[PDB]
From Swiss-Prot, chain A:
Protein name, UniProt field: Nuclear pore complex protein Nup50
Domain description: Contains FG repeats. FG repeats are interaction sites for karyopherins (importins, exportins) and form probably an affinity gradient, guiding the transport proteins unidirectionally with their cargo through the NPC. FG repeat regions are highly flexible and lack ordered secondary structure. The overall conservation of FG repeats regarding exact sequence, spacing, and repeat unit length is limited.
Span within the parent record: 1 to 46 of 466
Function per UniProt: Component of the nuclear pore complex that has a direct role in nuclear protein import. Actively displaces NLSs from importin-alpha, and facilitates disassembly of the importin-alpha:beta-cargo complex and importin recycling. Interacts with regulatory proteins of cell cycle progression including CDKN1B. This interaction is required for correct intracellular transport and degradation of CDKN1B.
Assembly with partners or alone: Does not interact with TPR. Interacts with Importin alpha-2, Importin beta, Importin beta-2, NUP153, Ran binding protein 7, CDKN1B and itself.
Gene ablation phenotype (knockout): NUP50 targeted disruption results in a complex phenotype characterized by neural tube defects, exencephaly, intrauterine growth retardation, and late embryonic lethality.
UniProtKB/Swiss-Prot annotation, chain B:
Record-annotated membrane-spanning stretches: none
Domain of life of the organism encoding this protein: Eukaryota
Stated name of the protein: Importin subunit alpha-1
Region (NLS binding site (minor)): 241-329
UniProt record similarity statement: Belongs to the importin alpha family.
A molecular function GO annotation: nuclear import signal receptor activity
Residue ranges the record marks as coiled coil: none
GO biological process: entry of viral genome into host nucleus through nuclear pore complex via importin; positive regulation of viral life cycle; postsynapse to nucleus signaling pathway; protein import into nucleus
Range within the parent protein: 75 to 498 of 529
This protein's domain notes: Consists of an N-terminal hydrophilic region, a hydrophobic central region composed of 10 repeats, and a short hydrophilic C-terminus. The N-terminal hydrophilic region contains the importin beta binding domain (IBB domain), which is sufficient for binding importin beta and essential for nuclear protein import.
Gene: Kpna2
CC terms in the record's Gene Ontology section: cytoplasmic stress granule; cytosol; glutamatergic synapse; host cell; NLS-dependent protein nuclear import complex; nucleoplasm; postsynaptic density
Annotated ARM repeat ranges: 1-37, 38-77, 78-119, 126-170, 172-208, 209-248, 251-290, 293-335, 336-382, 383-422
């Protein structure tokens, strides 16, 4: 299953609300300690 | 301007008139908006007197007066309510449901609803004492429209309270007795009744697939689907959540919402100005694309893929996360032709744009989506053209950059895509 229940329990007393409007942001980069041992390949271009 | 002592000496006397007058003075004091002596009459030990008067079938006015006085106390804090329950009010109120006097019956309906609304414990007590049958009797009329709106609303609200809460959720057999009447209510034309009934269904479907099965077996879907297209936000919201909860269930249960024509309403739900609706509708779609190929096929047939592509592209981030799930579920269970169609709808670009987000989980979802799409391209020997689409829109740079993602799994999936479709 790829099925998932709702993130928050919706009720007749909380349905009308502002959802903070989250921002996409940027992903966290691996530390230097991690990178020194990670094999990283360059992608070919066309 | 009576005092509690005045009420006591009148209530405890053998003078019938003094008892009624004292009971009415009590009710009036408890109604006061600015500082009502709830605690004072409770400490005065009046609850037991009121409960006893509920049984005075001979004196209807004192019955009404004490039911109201007991209700005003039940409607208070989650302490004053407990005093009423301990006073034995539950079974007493239940026997008043069949009262010939409507205003007395209603008072009983309201009191029972407030009590069951306190929490799961009181709710089960109201059920255990047999409130359901008498309550359903009051709705067993040929034309529900003949009932006063106010009356009907209190009843629906009360039933909804018997369906609310999950620790634990209502007993299965009790839910089973309530479902048939709930379905009939979904046919009413009063928005308040409809909203409350939909909320009730949303609570009953919020749980194990076994509970969903019962709600579906009782035939609530066709009606919920119709309410999905309601114009009233207070109705659409719970109706959508109820349908959303049902499709978290089995493929068979999910087919029932598809057969009821639910998909035909999504083009509007996915384009609804209210972002909450859009979010809940996309979440609902993700659970439908999580099903069988033939179901994904119906999503296709209803022209819904373009709308999902649309939400993934333009829409709040919270809604885009749900869309990402909807797309990844689709690429995961769909056929090659279904995937080819997805790519044709312009899914690549908006999918890549989200590969720079802080939410690691969304990145993994999108990476698995891209992975599934490349597998379909392999079968068609079109892997190369897919690579160019990805590269040409800046997606390759994002995949390459994720090799520096803090999460190892994200790094591994990026690497793998690189060494398979961007090798050399």
């Amino acid at each position: 299953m790829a099925k998932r229940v709702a993130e928050k329990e919706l009720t007749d007393r909380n349905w009308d609300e502002e959802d903070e409007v989250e921002e996409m942001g940027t992903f966290s980069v691996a530390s230097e300690e991690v990178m020194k041992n990670r094999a990283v390949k360059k992608a070919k271009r066309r | 301007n009576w005092s509690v002592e005045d009420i006591v000496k009148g209530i405890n006397s053998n003078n019938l008139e003094s008892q009624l007058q004292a009971t009415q003075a009590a009710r009036k004091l408890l109604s006061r908006e600015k500082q009502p002596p709830i605690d004072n009459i409770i400490r005065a030990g009046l609850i037991p007197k009121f409960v006893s008067f509920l049984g005075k079938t001979d004196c209807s006015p004192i019955q009404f007066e004490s039911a109201w006085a007991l209700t005003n106390i039940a409607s208070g804090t989650s302490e004053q309510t407990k005093a009423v329950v301990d006073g034995g009010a539950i079974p007493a109120f239940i026997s008043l449901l069949a009262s010939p006097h409507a205003h007395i019956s209603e008072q009983a309906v309201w009191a029972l609803g407030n009590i069951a609304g306190d929490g799961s414990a009181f709710r089960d007590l109201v059920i255990k004492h047999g409130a359901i049958d008498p309550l359903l009797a009051l709705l067993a009329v040929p034309d529900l429209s003949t009932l006063a709106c106010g009356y009907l609303r209190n009843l629906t609200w009360t039933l909804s309270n018997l369906c609310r809460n999950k620790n634990p959720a209502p007993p299965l057999d009790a839910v089973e007795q309530i479902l048939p009447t709930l379905v009939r209510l979904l046919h009413h034309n009063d928005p308040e009744v409809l909203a409350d009934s939909c909320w009730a269904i949303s609570y009953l479907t919020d749980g194990p697939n076994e509970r969903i099965e019962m709600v579906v077996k009782k035939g609530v879907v066709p009606q919920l689907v119709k309410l999905l297209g309601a114009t009233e936000l207070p109705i659409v919201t719970p109706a959508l959540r109820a349908i959303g909860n049902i499709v978290t269930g089995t493929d068979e249960q999910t087919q029932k919402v598809i057969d009821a024509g639910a998909l035909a309403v999504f083009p509007s739900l996915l384009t609804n100005p209210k972002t909450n609706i859009q979010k809940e509708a996309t979440w609902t779609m993700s659970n439908i694309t999580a099903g069988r190929q033939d179901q994904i096929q119906q999503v296709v047939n209803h022209g819904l893929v373009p709308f999902l592509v649309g939400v993934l592209s333009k829409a709040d981030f919270k809604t885009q996360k749900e869309a990402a799930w909807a797309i990844t579920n689709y690429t995961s269970g769909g056929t090659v032709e279904q995937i080819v169609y997805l790519v044709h709808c312009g899914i690549i670009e908006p999918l890549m744009n989200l590969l720079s987000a802080k939410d690691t989980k969304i990145i993994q979802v999108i990476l698995d989506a891209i992975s599934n799409i490349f597998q379909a391209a392999e079968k068609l020997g079109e892997t190369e053209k897919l690579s160019i689409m990805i590269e040409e829109c800046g997606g390759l740079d994002k995949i390459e950059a994720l090799q520096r993602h803090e999460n190892e799994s994200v790094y591994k999936a990026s690497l793998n895509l690189i060494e398979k479709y961007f090798s050399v």
